[PDB]
Amino acid sequence: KSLSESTICCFGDSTTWGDNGCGGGGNDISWTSHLGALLGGAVVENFGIKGSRIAIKADRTDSFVERLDGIDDAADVYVVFGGVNDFSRNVPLGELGSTDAHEFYGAVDYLIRTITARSPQAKLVFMTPCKTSGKHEKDIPASDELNHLGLTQAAYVRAMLEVCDRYSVPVIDLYAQSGISPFLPEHRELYMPDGLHYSPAGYERLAHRIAAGLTAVCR
Numbered sequence: 001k002s003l004s005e006s007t008i009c010c011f012g013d014s015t016t017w018g019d020n021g022c023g024g025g026g027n028d029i030s031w032t033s034h035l036g037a038l039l040g041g042a043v044v045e046n047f048g049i050k051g052s053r054i055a056i057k058a059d060r061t062d063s064f065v066e067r068l069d070g071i072d073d074a075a076d077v078y079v080v081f082g083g084v085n086d087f088s089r090n091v092p093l094g095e096l097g098s099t100d101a102h103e104f105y106g107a108v109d110y111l112i113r114t115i116t117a118r119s120p121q122a123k124l125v126f127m128t129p130c131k132t133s134g135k136h137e138k139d140i141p142a143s144d145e146l147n148h149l150g151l152t153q154a155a156y157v158r159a160m161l162e163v164c165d166r167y168s169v170p171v172i173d174l175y176a177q178s179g180i181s182p183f184l185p186e187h188r189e190l191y192m193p194d195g196l197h198y199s200p201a202g203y204e205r206l207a208h209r210i211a212a213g214l215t216a217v218c219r
Helices: 032-038 064-070 084-088 104-118 153-166 185-190 200-217
Strands: 007-012 043-048 077-081 123-127
Touching: 007 032, 007 064, 032 043, 032 200, 064 104, 077 104, 077 200, 084 153, 104 123, 104 153, 123 200, 185 200
Parallel strands: 007 043, 007 077, 077 123
Antiparallel strands: none
């Protein structure tokens, strides 16, 4: 049950699938492709889907809530990394205690309960969604801008942290500490070409930060 002997299921959005900014790239450039070796030989599975919100919304059918039952249930560690699309595509926040999987609070609650039900011995770690400088041609706000509900990304991050706290879930706070900033021009150029996704070099750098984070909370 050490990390080097573990199978790690990475459940995420474009930033797990490996989008390089243009809808291209893919799993072979994602941080998931680097992580196993950084952890001494873990087997890493990529369950990232572009465009996916944590919460259900009527305009799509591929939310994390909807996808969960179809991902591997037999892994040793689950790493859940999402929420930037909930912010950018106006998922209602709700309140702590929600069980509506159309609200962000309720969707995070559903994921933790349901991962635990289907994978009762696995470790579960959430990673807060990374910042973005926005992609307005796709109507995606920057992290510090308001979405159409009048919320910033920080409200979604706080909600995730509060639900994780309820269930004592370890968190790697990539929102606050990924070490790659889309607000810095050199990091846009090298690591985050569209201010939201990652280049191959950006995903390699992110993999190192994620490895350190996982080692810090799992043994």
